[model samples]
Target: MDKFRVQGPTKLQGEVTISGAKNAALPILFAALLAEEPVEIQNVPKLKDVDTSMKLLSQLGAKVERDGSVHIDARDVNVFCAPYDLVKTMRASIWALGPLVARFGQGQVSLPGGCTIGARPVDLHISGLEQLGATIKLEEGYVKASVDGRLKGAHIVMDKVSVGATVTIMCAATLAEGTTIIENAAREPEIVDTANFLITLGAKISGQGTDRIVIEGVERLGGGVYRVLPDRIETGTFLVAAAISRGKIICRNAQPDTLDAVLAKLRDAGADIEVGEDWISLDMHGKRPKAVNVRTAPHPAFPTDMQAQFTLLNLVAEGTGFITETVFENRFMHVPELSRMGAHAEIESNTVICHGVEKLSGAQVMATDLRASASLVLAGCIAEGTTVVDRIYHIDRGYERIEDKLRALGANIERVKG
Candidate 1:
């Protein structure tokens, strides 16, 4: 396992360019299977999850060529089956099942079970697939699906807005027999970006930014080049890093509209934030930050992905800060790790209450998840002494070139391998 050793009391300055959204890139990679021609995706982040998705796609017989972003020619996919061994490793593998089923009329994919954060059930995905005329069966931890002909679209009202389910259904509906309408669909920026990418590939999609999404199934899709949007979570993470370290940072290639809620909270916390055409600048020097309450919600609201990092920002504020997480139940797993560094935090159910502390001394900490690992890094950035964060593989799953980006922002951090 690799660990990050960071020295504290460092002020970040200068500009850092954000990469493509991992969440948006995964489904678009899966969407490549829908076309027989070559598909090129620009602005794809170099991350573990992206590599995992590419490996899985290759395992399914797509010829993938990656240089910075991804360029895939899925024209020679020999296997339409995604076995349990490959799919079980990452939940994003479920994305391939939709495209495989749509293009080949049958797919066999493993059921991606829960993760450390929560039990992200595939019930919504299964239900939507069934509504699209797919016969689904669970056997030996695999989801076996078969369709007689083309999928017939139907109105699917998700019990809850799930990003996975929304993307899965959208992929399936693209080559369905008829039009499909998705109500209460996830409206995250990634979802909208995926929908836009699919549209560029000749899929008819509407109402992407809203709760209702309508897809008109096309007879077939052709390969095309698409550029992914910048990652909102990464943008927010860097913004919070600037806020906590009392620094100035310009996050380029950021989508300000996607992070309206988080930007608002950072401004409320007394950070000077400026939104430009495609970038966001945050200045927190010589500013007394105040505590602010945050509640995680769906798109256009405070994101669950940013909850932990923002909590770390609240740790050094002048007043009390409360965070209510409505997305995942076990998201507060980072609290215990943060407390090990002498930071005061209390967790009750889905709420985390953070009391302002004058200073935090570095300690050995373990990252429980991706976002938690980000919080640990932020904690290390502002601590009085050196902090070591283990299990950094979680951090690699999301952030692209994190150490390089932080170094560019003047952070005293490095990845140590042993």
Candidate 2:
């Protein structure tokens, strides 16, 4: 196990460039399987999830060459099976199913079911595929799909807006015979970026940043180069970090519009925040941070991914704060860990009530999930003494070079191997 040992209350001050969006990159990489030639993806973050996706692609016989970013040649991949072992490790592994079915006319992918948050059913994805002239069957934990002829495009109305289902359908419809219109499509910026990348790869797609998306299926897709958008979740995480530690930090390559809801809450909490086109600066020198009520929602609202980090910021605020998690049921996994460091917090079902303390005394803590691990790190940044955080593998799945970034910002943090 790897643990982060962080020393007390160091105000972070420096400029840090945010990495590419992991959520966008995951689907973009899966879309590469639809191409007939090599596809080069720039700005890919070096996280455990990305590596896991790359490994799965390699196991399917695709020639992958990765340096700082990912370079994949899926032209010669002949396999059509996605095993359960790899699919269970990361939910994103199921993204390959659509492209595999579209390119080869058949796909056998294991169903990636639940996670720590809630039951994330892939039924929406399966139903979308069935609407596009594919036959789907569930047997022995695997989803078997086959199409006798080329997939014919049709209209699909999702019961709810799901980012995963939206991207999966888009990839599958790229090679369909006619036009495919998706209603209630996810309006996330990452979804729009994925559509833009598909367009670059010779797929005709339109109306990506809205509730409705139109896809004009083509005969085939060709290889192209794409650069992913900024990571909005990382931007929000760092924004909360600056607010909690009373630090002045500049985050470059961040999208201000994508994080409007989080910015609204942070600004309400008494932080001096400056927003630009692709940058955000947090100035918290003399002002004391206040508490603000937060609720997670869909795009253009407060994201659930940043819920844990925001709760940690609320731990040291001037007053009590309330966090209502409308997205995930078990997202308050950090509440127990935060309480170990002298932070007063109580969880009632999906809501967490936080009472701000003057200071948090350091203690050993364990991370329950990816965002929870980051929340613990934020808590460690402002604690009074050395705080040891275990189960850091969860953090490695999202943030890239987190320790180095904090160290650059003058944080007294170091990762120790055990």
Candidate 3:
């Protein structure tokens, strides 16, 4: 186990290079199973989740290699079962179900365990795969899917917009027979990134950034190289960290266009922000940031992945702010932990009423989930005195070397190992 000990009242400065999007990379890694040759992904972030994804691929008998880039040779993926042990650690592990069935015609993957933030049922994924000519059943806590011959594409209209379902169905559809149309597909940039990667590997995909996506299934997919997109959630988190800490910072390798909604909220909070093609800079200059209300939604809207960190920003702002999280239930898991550090907030159903305080005093806090852990680390950077954040494995799941990145930005934070 590892924890973070952070000294408070620090202002962040200097440039920090953003890492590749884990959301994007995870799916692409799974989608690699569709390839017959070697698939190489560059700029992949070194995160625990990535490690887990690679390990899952290795268990599946893929030749997984890593250096500055991730090289996966899934041509000889012999294993078909994704056990509960690995699947429990990551919800995205279910992504393997689609590619495994698509390539090998059978996949037995454990159903993802309950998440800390909320229940993210894999029903949408199983249903979509069922619609694609696969026989799917739940047997002994695992999703057992098998298809006769090759997958035959069909029109899948998701009951709701889900990124996981969208990615799963799209991956399976790539090597299916006939064209697959996904209505109400996820419009996340990660989806677009994965779609582009698939296209680079000779899959025909169109309308990726829109609610309606079309995939023309091919006989088989060829291998190729792809550069994963930057982490928009991480970029948004750093922007909020700069504003909350009353500091100036530049985020390099960040795509400003992918974070328009988040940038709008930060600007509403009186943070001076500037953007270029590949960078975003924020200047708060010790100003008391104003509260900005936010509602979580799909792409082109505020993302729920960013709700916790944004809530941390509102905690230290000038006025009250309300965060309505429509994406997930119990996402306010950080609220109780933040309360331990002098934060004033009240949760009502899916919404949280944040009462901005003049200052926060640091205390020992436990991280409940991945994004919540990130919020707590940002809180520690601005709170008074020293703060200890325990259960940082949650943080390691998403962010890459976050404490090191914070230190590079002039934050007084250190990783303490047990």
Candidate 4:
């Protein structure tokens, strides 16, 4: 286990290029299993989860080659089971479930026993697959699914807006026998990226970035090249980093349109933000940012993944801010850890009342989850004295070279090996 020793009270400046979206890359990597030839994935971020996916792919008999990009040929995949040892640490392992069943007609995947922020049920993914004519059985801590000849597409109405469900069903539907109509699908940019990647590989998909998505099953999919999209969550994290540290930073390779909700919130919090084609520049020097109330929702709204960072932003702002989390039940795990560093917050069920404090003193904090770990780093950037953040494996699962990126932006942060 490695920990981060972040010396506080430093302003982050200069430019840093955003990495590929982990959320987007995971599903696309799994969807590569649909291709009969080698598919190349560009701009894939080197993260723990990505590495885990690669290991799982190799175990499943896919020839995975990594150079600057990820090359995967799933034509030789003979294994049909994703073992518990391989899927124990990352929840995204469930992504492989649908693709395997779609392509090989049989898949045995372990029930998700990974480090999650909440009770993120795989019921949605399971139910979506069941709708597509797969016989699903949960036996002895594994999800065993098998199809007959080929998956016959059907109309699937999602119980709610779930990104995991949307991506899983869409991936499985690509090789189905007919058209699959998904109503009330998640309207996230990552989903659009996945759709585009699938379309490039010969899968007919439409209405991606909307409430409904239609996927017409093809006979087979061929290999293609796909460039992953920028990480919107990372962009939002840097935006909050600038606001909380009262610094200036230009995030390269960022799509401002994808971060509309986060940018609007930062602008409301007194950060001077400018956007171009692929970059976002934020300046917050000589300003005491005001707190802004934010509510987490689906895409085009405040993201639940960014709620922890916004909570830190509101904690150091000028007034009170209310953060309502509707996406995840136990995402406020960072609140208690932040309280250890002189934060004043009150958690009322799914909502938290953040009372702004002028300054925070550093202390030893434990990272609870991926996004929660990021908020702690942002807190360390503004807190007085040095702050040591333990359990950073969570951050490594999502963000790539996070300490190095922060160091380049002038944050006094270093990773210490344990």
* Per-model root-mean-square deviation over C-alphas: 1.1, 1.1, 1.0, 1.1
lDDT of 4 by residue, 356-395 (tens): 9999989999986876679998899889999999999888
Q: Candidate 2 residues 373-416, lDDT tens each?
A: 79899889889999999989999999998989888888899889
Q: Which residue pairs overlap in candidate 4's backbone?
A: none
What's the CA error at residue 236 for candidate 4, in Å? Answer: 0.9
After TM-score superposition, the amount by which residue 281's alpha carbon in candidate 4 deviates from its true location, in angstroms, is 1.1
101-192 per-residue lDDT for model 1 (tens digits)? 88888888888866889878888988999999999998988888889998998998999989999999998999998889999999988888
Candidate 4, residue 140: Cα displacement in angstroms equals 1.7
Q: Give per-model TM-scores.
A: 0.98, 0.98, 0.98, 0.98
Query: Where does candidate 4 stray beyond 4 Å?
Result: 114-116
Candidate 2 accuracy as lDDT? 0.89
lDDT (C-alpha) at residue 308 in model 3: 93
How does candidate 3 fare on TM-score?
A: 0.98
Off by over 4 Å in 3: none
Compute the lDDT of residue 205 as modeled in candidate 4.
99
Better of 2 and 3 by lDDT: 3
